[PDB]
């Protein structure tokens, strides 16, 4: 019922994050999703790296991220990791 | 003729940030903007209240953010703030 | 030959960290470990709570960190997790 | 009374912060000090540059951090800065 998977919509390099796609996560100071962070899979090195994260204060912000990926053509895939206080990290890969 | 300003977006209580407006701040490891916060300040207290930072790894990610703020209505203005390591912070206030 | 775990020192509900614990990691714009994060496992539920993330930006700082946590005696173990660009997530377990 | 200045300790290019020196800040969900940054002043630009930021949930850890700071020579002096919540941002210079 309740959705802590971070969407991921890719409009050329630009990526907008939401979590969940249809229903907003809570956001108050005792449940709450801490961090969006986005993950670019490397093509040379199969390597798994960071490219950012979004920090929120608890209840201060819906868990909504946006990135812009440098150089995208250099990655195979884009992996987004969600952090909720309470039920830990929910990820999502989209193949490019 | 280069711009650090973080451009805000307002939709309802969603914002979008990118640096600057016209012209998008360099993304590379030696020059990046590292972080964007975004403030909200307070009506009741009239309080500086940060709402999140997005982080960006050096020549990982362009100088982008977004936010969706929480109970919009009990604040008075946003103040976004963006970090190049070159050249400083630049901000932006908006008037609710 | 190179170290990635992070040391973990406890004294009381202080906590210093290290990557690693007798060779310290590199420190270049190229090559770094961007986050140490400390993470505490909830006697009650079980959960894998984030305490704090030290952030460091690269080649600026080498991978130590501190945290002191809160009502210590409410987890039953601490999780220190590394990240390096080059070479991934490294955790440490620590049972209290 | 309640103090928020980072207090800094230097050790060779160690830096150990707590806010504040003597009494520790609070560290609730409702008032805490949510980040600890560390800055250094470049000789050659008189650039601030910030050397990385410790993050702690609210409540979750109290106002600590360390730092080991890249080629120290490199900088005329070290800059903490301290954010809570209710109280804004708490500064504190060390000339190196
Ligand atoms: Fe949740
Ligand atoms: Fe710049
Ligand atoms: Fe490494
Ligand atoms: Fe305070």
Redesign the interface.
């Given at each position: 019922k309740e959705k802590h998977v971070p969407e991921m919509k890719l409009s050329g390099?630009?990526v907008?994050i939401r979590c969940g796609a249809t229903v907003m996560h809570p956001?108050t100071?005792?449940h709450y999703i801490?961090?969006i962070r986005?993950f670019?899979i490397t093509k040379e090195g199969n390597?798994?790296?960071?490219?950012?994260?979004?920090?929120?204060?608890?209840?201060?912000?819906?868990?909504?991220?946006?990135?812009?990926?440098?150089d995208l053509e250099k990655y195979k895939g884009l992996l987004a990791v969600a952090?909720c206080?309470?039920h830990?990290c929910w990820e999502n890969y989209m193949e490019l």
């Open positions: 390099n630009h907008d956001a100071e005792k801490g961090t986005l670019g390597v798994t790296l960071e490219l950012g994260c979004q920090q929120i204060w608890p209840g201060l912000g819906e868990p909504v991220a946006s990135f812009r990926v440098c952090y206080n309470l830990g």
